[PDB]
Symmetry: C3
Subunit: 205 residues, 3 copies
């Protein structure tokens, strides 16, 4: 099949087109597989987003999530974004299941992060709404763990968001693990952190 190999039998090239087309759809299905994946989160963050300044966050797998904090597989966790109004300050909270800073290894870390809103430019600065971060008690009628605080105008943690998330400024030694793990708070391998940024004293239309 000398002067007839590529002649009679050049199907070996036709097979080259099938494969290429196959390689094309392989990438698309994949890109599409990833695209689809970001939709859930996008729905997920939206289904759980609040626009009244208040926020209730949920953390499942505290154990499988706590064990990763200790083994440094994921030092912190962020909450779904939330707002003070439909077009107001954008925010969220940051946590460390196995503490950090002065409360590291012996506490729960909970910070308040002033994210970069899409509507920044029409709002007042520096941010100045009082805050209240708490640990929710899921007991018969016990009490939750809270601690409010007012931003430091001086702090560059409360200014018009240049980069993505502002600088996390909460509490290093919020609550001792030996207290949260030894109590209701943890129920069914999960807990809930609350956040109450005042918006009332800022007439909401």
């Amino acid at each position: 099949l000398e002067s007839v190999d590529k002649s009679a039998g050049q199907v070996a090239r036709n097979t080259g087109l099938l494969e290429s087309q196959l390689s094309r759809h392989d990438q698309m299905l994949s890109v599409h597989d990833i695209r689809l994946a970001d939709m859930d989160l996008r729905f997920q963050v939206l289904e759980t987003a609040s626009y009244n300044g208040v926020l209730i966050w949920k953390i499942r797998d505290y154990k499988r999530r706590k064990q990763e904090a200790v083994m440094g597989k994921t030092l912190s966790l962020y909450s779904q974004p939330f707002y003070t109004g439909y077009f107001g300050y954008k925010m969220c909270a940051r946590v460390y299941l196995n503490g950090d800073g002065m409360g590291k290894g012996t506490h729960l870390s909970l910070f308040f992060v002033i994210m970069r809103g899409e509507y920044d430019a029409l709002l007042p600065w520096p941010f100045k709404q009082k805050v209240t971060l708490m640990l929710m008690d899921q007991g018969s009628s016990r009490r939750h763990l809270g601690d409010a605080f007012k931003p430091d105008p001086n702090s560059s943690s409360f200014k018009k968001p240049t980069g993505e998330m502002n600088i996390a400024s909460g509490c290093p030694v919020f609550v001792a693990q030996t207290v949260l793990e030894n109590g209701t708070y943890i129920k069914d391998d999960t807990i809930f952190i609350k956040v109450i940024v005042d918006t009332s004293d800022l007439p909401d239309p």
Copy 2:
């Protein structure tokens, strides 16, 4: 082509790879076809969800939907979920276009279902918000059909949601079909059911 069949001509195996790859993308496109499908609903339930305790539901195809009730192709219809607040009690309503129970075949059935919220554990029980379920009148200025009621603490229809939807506890003989079909209420093969779970008398932050 004895000792040369699978030798010279084993393309019949190469064709086995193209097909398999083809069978792989066939499943993905399909799974992806179904995934995409659930997004609409997910958007649809969200685009129509209310967080102020009130709810306006819409039912199109009353006829093609009523005829299936009679021919037992779909005895009831559920509404989009709704809430009393951003992180409050989750709910929704249930209907029977061709009645059920004592109003079966001669009435419209409308129930109030206390679904299992994602935020159950931080809320008060048993549920105790008064309710008002009504049939909206689309007439020049006529009146709608309503009937409020207060949960029975005794009832296991108003407790912290173990399974998915709580136990449907509304009204079997809400309105007679011969009254809804013989009146404005039905306009352009559709109707709207309203629901007013009190939330006011529960200071909403």
Copy 3:
């Protein structure tokens, strides 16, 4: 290969099946590529939708967007829909970066469009909520450009939406370009238009 061509060698038909299957997935991936695309917008319009009657719209690329107005590549821009309530009047605004009508080529055009709501039939007509359309000032502490107005019951621009968007009835000569371009308002190739449809004087449950 006379009476054996299609006989021994009819792989040329087998290759016809691979391709067809390939052509099938080609269309699906594409349809799916477009479907995925509409989700973003659907999320995008939702992430930015307001249900309190107020609205803050954002227009990026004013220049690349203004230059198209002059070269007639896109005479106007529409905002994300918005409402007065969860099930209230649906609306939005219309703009012309290079004016239109009496303010054409020398002004910014901003109209108020009463869209066709999904919940039209249960609401009061003709629409009668005062309106306030303004141009937001992104300056150190300057002022924005506003101008309220009350619908004309006479106008067929404020009635129960037959077709899609009602008839755009705003202001042709809202603000002179030479004033908006020569001032803060434009910052980082973008601007923001505001809209304040009264809803307060319509007890919102």
